[PDB]
Amino acid sequence: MREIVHIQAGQCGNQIGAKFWEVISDEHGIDPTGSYHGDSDLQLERINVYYNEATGNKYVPRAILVDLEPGTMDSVRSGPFGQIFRPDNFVFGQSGAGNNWAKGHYTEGAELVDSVLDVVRKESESCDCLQGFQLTHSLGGGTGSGMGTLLISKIREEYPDRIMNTFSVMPSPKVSDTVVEPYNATLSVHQLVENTDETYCIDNEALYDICFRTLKLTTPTYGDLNHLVSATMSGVTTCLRFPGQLNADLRKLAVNMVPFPRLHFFMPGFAPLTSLTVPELTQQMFDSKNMMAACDPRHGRYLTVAAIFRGRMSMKEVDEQMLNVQNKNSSYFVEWIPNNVKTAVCDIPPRGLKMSATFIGNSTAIQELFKRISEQFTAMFRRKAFLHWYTGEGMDEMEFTEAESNMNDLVSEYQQYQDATAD
Amino acid sequence: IQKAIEENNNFIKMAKEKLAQKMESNKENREAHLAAMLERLQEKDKHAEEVRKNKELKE
Amino acid sequence: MRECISIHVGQAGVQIGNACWELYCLEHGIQPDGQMPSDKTIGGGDDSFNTFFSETGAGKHVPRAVFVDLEPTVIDEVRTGTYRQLFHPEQLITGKEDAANNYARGHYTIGKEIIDLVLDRIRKLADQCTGLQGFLVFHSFGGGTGSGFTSLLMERLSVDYGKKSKLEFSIYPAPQVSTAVVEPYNSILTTHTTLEHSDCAFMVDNEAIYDICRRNLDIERPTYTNLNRLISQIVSSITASLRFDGALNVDLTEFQTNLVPYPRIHFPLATYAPVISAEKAYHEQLSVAEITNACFEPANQMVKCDPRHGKYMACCLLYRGDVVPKDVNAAIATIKTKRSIQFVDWCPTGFKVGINYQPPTVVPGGDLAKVQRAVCMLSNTTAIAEAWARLDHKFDLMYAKRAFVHWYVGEGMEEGEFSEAREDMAALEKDYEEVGVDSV
Ligand SMILES: Nc1nc2c(ncn2[C@@H]2O[C@H](COP(=O)(O)OP(=O)(O)OP(=O)(O)O)[C@@H](O)[C@H]2O)c(=O)[nH]1
Ligand SMILES: Nc1nc2c(ncn2[C@@H]2O[C@H](COP(=O)(O)OP(=O)(O)O)[C@@H](O)[C@H]2O)c(=O)[nH]1
Ligand SMILES: [Ca+2]
Ligand SMILES: [Mg+2]
Ligand SMILES: [Mg+2]
């Protein structure tokens, strides 16, 4: 009876959001019609976290679908589980964002934001005790990046004591030739640093490399990248959806993962990744090749880590192997946060796997991600390239400089605590 | 026996006042924390108005 | 008279409370519906077990207990569990949002919204008592409710009941089963706020209980159920003098006189024996001497520390079962001639002994063997300060960087409360050093 309200904005946000509901609906035994046909009572014990139960014993995702164009949301409605979403929770426009953060944040998005809040408000009123919100979106586009960060600010104004979580997709030249993505992404990070409590960094650069290098996919599609996002999102929400002791709600997760409010950008990880023992799950789980953000954790230090093991296995062996990895890699865990690695175990494994492992790391090595975006940002901002797309919507030059400085400061803060010492 | 009564009453008294001060100081601090949060958010809305006006005048 | 009200706060306190009251019902012959065929006085009585159980006109024996948690899922198991008919609905109090492992939310933001209702329900129990003796408060150090709401409750109880005695059973955190990085913070904050409001506190180191279950009972990965059933036995031994009577029975308050030389030095170290599985206990009878010797094996302590490197200020032996003073005295004599039991120079060295003849009980499906005799030692040793030192060190590591402090400030707390609490702990560690120094 601790409800989460889900929001998905823009093309990317709606696609990964739709597949998120497909996966967890299968895990909870919910079919596309909303009826339960599972075999375990553990599936329904915390179903209220993500589902409303309309009379008739059908479960309706507590989900809101937003986009400044109908295209992506029309495929959701006509796809699998499209009929499970509440039709009133579809809020779309016709103008579009044109991959312009300013359009989605200040102009077109500002016209539609009020109607979205009406739906957020209606859903939140019927909550026994709202936990907070989780937003799926990309930072390289216009709607998900611009209007998504706008929704965050407006929701926070009305629910300032609730947790704001985001699944943010970072742009990569390997998965988009659209050139103004460094701008839209830097402007988005500027907002996320200030108005979110927890952000999972879904780096498209990492997803591509996993599909190509590891899984041997010459031409990775958005569907291939999204199969990783779905498995990851399922993993990092397992503690919220099933009975458990560790990080069972958004606030407790934030308290365990965020030692400083601005440093709330996590590095997801998943294992196995195959185109299986507990020692191998744990070794791979801490390997750079299994990270959903294109950063090497051995280039920084871990502030906090959450490990989630799924499937039937030996808890004694899990505890042993988690102690083993920390001891053998003690240099990569800050001394001044004792016992900063917490472990959860869920008896229910994902679909198609006998056992899996999900990794949530708050590592200073994440600066490599922001450094990559910053390098792409300054390369164009130095040339004032494409700024008329943004000044034409009313923006000022300072706002670009401010977003730049704030992201560069975020990098410095990660380096500060990476260099910090106990003695 | 009167001194025993006085000390026990002073312990109750001082415990009641210390707690009343903590709960009051805590309410004011938390309210000030939220006030600053919304005043920053409302400044963003005010800034969004300038952006939309800066564009309208550009036409 | 001499009624005792128990208060179980947070998940740890509630779940330990479930194990304790189940064990009590078995020790006294009370059924899950509260009926007790052996009790021939219906509706009331002055028997020893009435210190912990009230009686209704319908023959139900009701725990003098309140369960409080800021979220409902744990107490909900009590509402639907095997002993749901044992408690009146008003004894089980729940909120909708927990403290998110944040002392500030348990003591202020969330706790303040339910504190008045909790005090009201405690008052309802106190009004039923003709001679209330005090309270027993079960809570964890690490949880936001167990730390923050307990401190608030303790402060309020001092106001509403004066210096009426309040005893704690406190769960000291262990990495093997901990659920929050900030548990050192919450531990220091609640220890400081409760220090002046507690007369006696028994700390239970989860790592000590964890190791005991692994080593003595061969439980590979002990669960809370494993830990809590062991903790129940220790709590039972401690309260047995209040719930039973006998010629050789010694009241817990009389041990207290010896265990607390100064108000702040009120943290006894408990050691329990025998902890043995049914397989090893078979055809192996453990004598009085053997279980007494086990009390001085540090591996059987409830808190990890080395009394061999500290000084004793009191030693109490609480036996239960087939035990007579003759065998006790012989066992004690052997131990003094072969163990490093160094007392401070300002305390007598004699051991204080109590014997309850009711033998120990085990819950069905448990791991502990049923034995004919058991013992819990309660000693006041400077070595228990080791537990403070370990916790204070983890506090200093994080607080030097103000790690996670924003979660507390955001809920209304100030850094001054952190430093104030830490300084009180430093003085407490200092107090344990001074009491161990020889007199000039
Ligand atoms: N021995 C024992 N320890 C427990 C038990 N349950 C929780 N703990 C310990 O208590 C600490 C966490 O505090 P909890 O009691 O679970 O939290 P809480 O009091 O409900 O506070 P919030 O959940 O934050 O509102 C950790 O150190 C756990 O290891 C239990 O049943 N037995
Ligand atoms: N993983 C993934 N990334 C996407 C998807 N669609 C778009 N993106 C990324 O998002 C960015 C474009 O933003 P987009 O969501 O299409 O614009 P929007 O409709 O205004 O939100 C690009 O950098 C893409 O790599 C998708 O289905 N999956
Ligand atoms: Ca009776
Ligand atoms: Mg696109
Ligand atoms: Mg709890």
Author numbering:
A (entry chain D): 1 to 42, 45 to 277, 286 to 360, 369 to 441
B (entry chain E): 83 to 141
C (entry chain C): 1 to 440
What's the paper's own text on this?
Microtubules (MTs) are ubiquitous cytoskeletal polymers built from α/β-tubulin heterodimers that assemble into a pseudo-helical cylinder. Tubulin exists in two different conformations related to its polymerization state: curved (depolymerized) and straight (assembled into MTs). The binding and hydrolysis of guanosine nucleotides rule the polymerization-depolymerization of tubulin through chemical-linked conformational stages. GDP-tubulin remains inactive in the cytoplasm and the GTP exchange at the exchangeable site (E) on β-tubulin activates the α/β-heterodimers, providing interacting surfaces prone to the addition onto growing bent sheets or protofilaments (PFs) at the MT end.
Before setting crystallization plates, we incubated the GDP-T2R-TTL complexes with either BeF3- or AlFx (prepared in situ from mixtures of AlCl3 and HKF2 to avoid Al precipitation) to produce GDP-T2R-TTL-BeF3- and GDP-T2R-TTL-AlFx complexes, respectively. The AlCl3/HKF2 mixtures we used produce roughly ~50% AlF3 and ~50% AlF4-, and the related moiety was modeled as AlF3. AlF3 was further stabilized through interactions with loops T2 and T3 and α-phosphate. We hypothesize that this configuration likely represents a transitional stage of Pi release, where the Mg2+ ion removes the γ-phosphate while moving to a new coordination position between α- and β-phosphates. Loop T5 in chain B is blocked due to tubulin axial contacts; however, at chain D, this loop refined in a dual conformation during the structure model-building: 57% in GTP-like ‘flip-out’ and 43% in GDP-like ‘flip-in’ conformations (Figure 1F, comparison with GTP- (black) and GDP-bound (gray) structures). Likewise, AlFx induced tubulin activation with a binding constant in the mM range, which might reflect the fact that part of the molecules had their loop T5 in a GTP-bound conformation according to the crystal structure of AlF3 tubulin complexes. Previous studies showed similar equilibrium binding constants of addition to the MT, regardless of AlFx concentration and the clear competition between both AlFx and BeF3- for the same site on MTs.
